[PDB]
Amino acid sequence: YEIQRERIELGRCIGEGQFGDVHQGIYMSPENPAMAVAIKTCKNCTSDSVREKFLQEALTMRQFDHPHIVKLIGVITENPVWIIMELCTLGELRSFLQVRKFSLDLASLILYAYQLSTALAYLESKRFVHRDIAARNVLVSATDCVKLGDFKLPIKWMAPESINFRRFTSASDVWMFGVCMWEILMHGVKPFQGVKNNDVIGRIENGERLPMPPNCPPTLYSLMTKCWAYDPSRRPRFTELKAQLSTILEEEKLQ
Numbered sequence: 001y002e003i004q005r006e007r008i009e010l011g012r013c014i015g016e017g018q019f020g021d022v023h024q025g026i027y028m029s030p031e032n033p034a035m036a037v038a039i040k041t042c043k044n045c046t047s048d049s050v051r052e053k054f055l056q057e058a059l060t061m062r063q064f065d066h067p068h069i070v071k072l073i074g075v076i077t078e079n080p081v082w083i084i085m086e087l088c089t090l091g092e093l094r095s096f097l098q099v100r101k102f103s104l105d106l107a108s109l110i111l112y113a114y115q116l117s118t119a120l121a122y123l124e125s126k127r128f129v130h131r132d133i134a135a136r137n138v139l140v141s142a143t144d145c146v147k148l149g150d151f152k153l154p155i156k157w158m159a160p161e162s163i164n165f166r167r168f169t170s171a172s173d174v175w176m177f178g179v180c181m182w183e184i185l186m187h188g189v190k191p192f193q194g195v196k197n198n199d200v201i202g203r204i205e206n207g208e209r210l211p212m213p214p215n216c217p218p219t220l221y222s223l224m225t226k227c228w229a230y231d232p233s234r235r236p237r238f239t240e241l242k243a244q245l246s247t248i249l250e251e252e253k254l255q
């Protein structure tokens, strides 16, 4: 997986990552003389601590093979350290939804939820817990294809047991997925706008939940609400979410 730096032509900055800017570029490879790629960079990669955390993402992504999870292409492990990834040419999901708010039909939004559910059912099948499911970590490969894209706490997305006890499980991922579905159906609006991170848990404990997005199907909102059961053992698994989203999608496409 090590790639010679001379094989990479760094292009334009496409966005911001947790560790530094992400660029588009070209990988001039034996298999493909002009492969379009994304290049993740890391500020302060001279710190062993930071570099270990950065490159851990690449190690993680290398373990997965799924149509809706972004693929690792390789790494450059000399300063400045870079991770070379599959390029998703339509960019981050939140930006995409906000810009295309009035060009995306409901069927596409449900499709995106469904595709993410397929990725997360796959991770569940491997007993992998993601811990940070949110629209900010999803990328758009085509107008009909989204992918999970990325391996201070995201309190507004977290399950109550995660906030209270720092416990993350497959069940907490489902809660976060519920929030991510809400985000999609809200065209990339963040949950709990105007609320302080410290006041989120009080509202959750008081039985409050994110409201039904405008134009959201009732079957779909009901599914979200099931993801947000206080007791983790009452939340569905991703196999059930995927099946229900497929039926909802098909009902929408028949409309």
Ligand SMILES: Cc1nnc(=O)[nH]c1Nc1cccc(C(F)(F)F)c1
Binding pocket: 013, 014, 015, 016, 017, 022, 038, 040, 070, 085, 086, 087, 088, 089, 090, 091, 092, 139, 149, 150
């Ligand atoms: C990991 C990855 N793989 N393929 C990509 O095409 N982009 C990626 N990451 C990423 C992270 C943050 C922001 C943005 C951007 F450019 F805004 F979309 C992209």
